Design a binder for this molecule. Structure first.
Ligand code: HEM
Ligand SMILES: CC1(C)[C@@H]2CC[C@@]1(C)C(=O)C2
Ligand SMILES: [K+]
Length: 405
């Protein structure tokens, strides 16, 4: 249903896009969002779906809004309004200047030096999963690799038992793509209920895992509070359980459907990092936003204090004003423009971990299983939300064409 149009919002800017169930979803989720960049769609539209909110449709406006934290605050960064209001993860719910001391701490548990320390385990897990799959000649990619690989790495980093994954994964998914059994506030409450006693335990007896490091950390030289540590750990959990997991499935679906692209990476392994970047542009998948701190005129549109604005990270790289032939995957693309990992002061802290997971996946998979396709008959379905994803990805191949390492 459609929220009544607010008096201040011009009728000619109304485009009722539903970010949790977009009209054109069956053509693929990026395609469905890309309808916002068809001719005759303004740079900034209002949807009456999900309580009503603005959507910036072009990378120029998305970037500008992300840079301007004084007008576009991350205090309420999710749609619908109930979810954005409840949302209190650190650092994402804070604006500069107060945000920064918290980023620095988070960077200590997911930053480059940590990723370098994880490198061998990341490599081993990829190899163990793929080798185990190789003789079978099929898999359900979402459950058999896309989920266990990045998630087990995160649980290792966090010192959390893998048997807790089903519960934590369910809760994280309700925050990004709710099935309707839980509001965002209920899912958050449950994530914090899980975390509170582990945070307390690890402040009493500090270990070397990421929760211990955050919960015993300092921010600008003063001790972090129990409550702050919980709000940061919760975010780390969502990042670990619902980002790369989804991205790997878009990429693998594409590689399954495109022998010529796999062939390029098989003949030319050195291109994998570039291919990773071009897939991160084409299969970009996050869309969150900001709240207006004051009435503000932005690109000839009057925004009112309290208005929410969706600033889809997904859209910048798909905009033909940033990338010619944006729906085409070109691993040789010269200037790969995107905001897949966000933009401005909230630039993704997990991006080095993400790219390492993606590049290790591509290298290891294409080495052992160069030739695969979608299961015959399978109608691949995407799902949309704050993070988009793939419902199921059944793959098949002939074991005879695979290679043991
Ligand atoms: C394909 C993988 C990933 C994508 C596309 C992604 C995307 C994003 C985006 C767009 C933001 C900014 C959101 C905003 O400005 O409101 C962000 C922030 C963040 N990401 Fe990622 N991310 C990914 C992987 C990860 C992983 C694996 C982790 C950690 C386990 C993580 C940790 C974080 C954290 C802690 C922030 C908040 C930084 C801040 O608010 O200052 N990310 N990410
Ligand atoms: C938008 C995000 C991808 C970013 C990290 C996890 C996520 C869902 C957030 O709450 C901030
Ligand atoms: K909030």
């Amino acid at each position: 249903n459609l929220a009544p149009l607010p008096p201040h919002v011009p009728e000619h800017l109304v485009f009722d896009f539903d970010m949790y169930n977009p009209s054109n979803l069956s053509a693929g989720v990026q395609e469905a969002w890309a309808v916002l960049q068809e001719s005759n769609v303004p740079d900034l539209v209002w949807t009456r779906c999900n309580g009503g909110h603005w959507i910036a449709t072009r990378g120029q406006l998305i970037r500008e809004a992300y840079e301007d934290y004084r007008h576009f605050s991350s205090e309420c960064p999710f749609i619908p309004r109930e979810a954005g209001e409840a949302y209190d993860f650190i650092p994402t719910s804070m604006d500069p200047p107060e945000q920064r001391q918290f980023r620095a701490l988070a960077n200590q548990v997911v930053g480059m030096p940590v990723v370098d320390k994880l490198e061998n385990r990341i490599q081993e897990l990829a190899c163990s999963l793929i080798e185990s799959l190789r003789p079978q000649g099929q898999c359900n990619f979402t459950e058999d690799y896309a989920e266990p690989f990045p998630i087990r790495i995160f649980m290792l980093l966090a010192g959390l038992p893998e048997e807790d994954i089903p519960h934590l994964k369910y809760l994280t998914d309700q925050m990004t793509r709710p099935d309707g059994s839980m509001t965002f506030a209920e899912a958050k409450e449950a994530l914090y209920d899980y975390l509170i006693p582990i945070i307390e335990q690890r402040r009493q007896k500090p270990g070397t895992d990421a929760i211990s490091i955050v919960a015993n950390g300092q921010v600008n030289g003063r001790p972090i509070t129990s409550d702050e540590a919980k709000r940061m750990c919760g975010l780390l959990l969502v990042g670990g359980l619902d980002t790369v997991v989804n991205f790997l499935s878009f990429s693998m679906e594409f590689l399954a459907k495109s022998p010529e692209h796999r062939q390029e990476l098989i003949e030319r392994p050195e291109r994998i990092p570039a291919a990773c970047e071009e897939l991160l542009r084409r299969f970009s998948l996050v869309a969150d936003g900001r709240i207006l701190t004051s009435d503000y005129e932005f690109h000839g549109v009057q925004l009112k204090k309290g208005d929410q604005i969706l600033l889809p990270q997904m859209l910048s790289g798909l905009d033909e004003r940033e990338n010619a032939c944006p729906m085409h995957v070109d691993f040789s693309r010269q200037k790969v423009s995107h905001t897949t990992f966000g933009h401005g002061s909230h630039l993704c802290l997990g991006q080095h971990l993400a790219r390492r997971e993606i590049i290790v996946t591509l290298k290891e998979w294409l080495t052992r299983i160069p030739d695969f396709s979608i299961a015959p008959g399978a109608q691949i379905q995407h799902k949309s939300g704050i993070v988009s994803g793939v419902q199921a990805l059944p793959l098949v191949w002939d074991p005879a064409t695979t290679k043991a390492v």
